[PDB]
Amino acid sequence: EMVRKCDPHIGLLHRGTEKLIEYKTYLQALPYFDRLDYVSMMCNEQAYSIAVEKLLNIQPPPRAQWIRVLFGEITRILNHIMAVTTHALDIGAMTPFFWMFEEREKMFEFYERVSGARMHAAYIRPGGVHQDLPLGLLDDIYEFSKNFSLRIDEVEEMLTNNRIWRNRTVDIGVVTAEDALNYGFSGVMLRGSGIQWDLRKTQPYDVYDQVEFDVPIGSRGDCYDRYLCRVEEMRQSLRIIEQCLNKMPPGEIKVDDA
Amino acid sequence: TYKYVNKKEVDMKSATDNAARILMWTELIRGLGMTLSYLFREPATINYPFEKGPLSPRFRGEHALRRYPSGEERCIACKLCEAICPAQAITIEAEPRADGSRRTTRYDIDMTKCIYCGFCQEACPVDAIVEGPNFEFSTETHEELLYNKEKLLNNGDKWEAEIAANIQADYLYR
Amino acid sequence: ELVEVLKRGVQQVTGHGGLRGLLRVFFRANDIRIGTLVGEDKYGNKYYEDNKQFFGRHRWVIYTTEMNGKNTFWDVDGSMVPPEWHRWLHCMTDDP
Amino acid sequence: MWFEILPGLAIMGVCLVIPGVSTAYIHKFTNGGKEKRVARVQYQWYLMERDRRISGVNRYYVSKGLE
């Protein structure tokens, strides 16, 4: 029962996404990005958007920027609910997944009522968003946000201090700070080791500069610490979502350059 | 601005407190209370056939080709729905109908190829091809999923009333 | 409190016509609840909406036997609901 | 609500009392109306068999002062 060497094999899901894009136009390659990592459906689009906007030296209108940060964060929650609850299902805790997949479900509905698709929206396009938010979404992205916290709190009362979660997670996969930068970890994995780097604060993109959030840095980096970090960004994203609802500007959602 | 998620005397009171936590499993009992609590909450599930999960007007669902109220099919075979389809799903070949008008002899959406992006809904100038609300079109055989003009036109006629209501609700937004 | 809970259960059971009528609703849906009848479409179907129930279950359709002569009483199908009433069921439009 | 987990339990409970009531009445009916005597040590058997030898061919049959 001891692992001497792990050689992960990859490509069981290689599909050609990088070659296929060369044969497609910029707007018809946007749907590929949603599929690249589809737990995080939109946040991925924003990266292509930004990239295509830079090449054109065009920037999205003010309302679109806030939207992208609004749905950018909602998407972060969606990913963390996936990562924390799926982590537990493999560990053996199954009730957190059902608790938070109901909240996920409710979020998907935001996607659907904004894009049309539950996931794989194609809403964030290279020049802003595709269509303004439906007349009424903001209010519901509030009711949900107003409550989601308690739902994160519950998971906590079940796992953060479980006498057993800690054991299987604490002091497992500790990664040094120097080694994390060396192997290009660049994520919570770095942040969990105590390196302070959030590309959202260091190199602001969209209007993530106009919001105020706290990066959840960690010490004694290990599976448990990073987890705590992911639960904390779920918390911090609710702080960013609140603001976006409180301060989203009247305006157009796509560049005016036909 | 950063925050330390987990960054951190021994008194009988303290220790006795800590020892009781290990000995009588106090925190474990805390976790049981949470699940007992929900057992008493109303379940969120819906009777699937009887009650349906809500989908708003922009839901893309299943492809349909609309017709003008008069009865003339909207498509005029400009074929840019074919041009912008990301998956190469739509195949269109056309010829001037005897009327002299321009119509598609063959319009084939391969739904297995289609990834339901909804750009075709976007691209059409006459808005002849629309993303219809229905999502329940699972089929026993692969061939049934390939759709020619007659199935889509028939799909259009069946769901035209709701498609018209859905487009009515969302056109100002577009 | 719970006695009123019990009276609500009794009214739900009495609500679906006779003992045989609720047995019919019991077997095909497995859920007994009483709601105002919004409409009956020409294909046999009956639709009920209750404001009190949560968003997922406040609108339900009780399917009817042979809506195109198919013996549909037991093999209930989602597609049976007509296109006009499909959006009402899925909450696409509030209006019946 | 949670009202529904009860149906199933009812059929478990009912199926866990049967055994205890059953074993404890198929004893009081196959031992002449009296608990089935428990022969744990030689002496309890002796008196049990002595009694058999006392009358009829079964122990529950208990001859009294009028014998």
């Binding site: - | 209370g33 109303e42 | 404001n51 968003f55 | -």
Partner: peptide, 28 residues
């Protein structure tokens, strides 16, 4: 909802916080 005021209190006591304020049943 439809807590009846006793299942709700068992719910509140077991959870340790008020779920009534942040319910799982979305309403109008």
């Amino acid at each position: 909802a439809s807590a009846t005021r006793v299942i709700q209190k068992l719910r509140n006591w077991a959870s340790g916080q008020d779920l009534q304020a942040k319910l799982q049943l979305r309403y109008q």
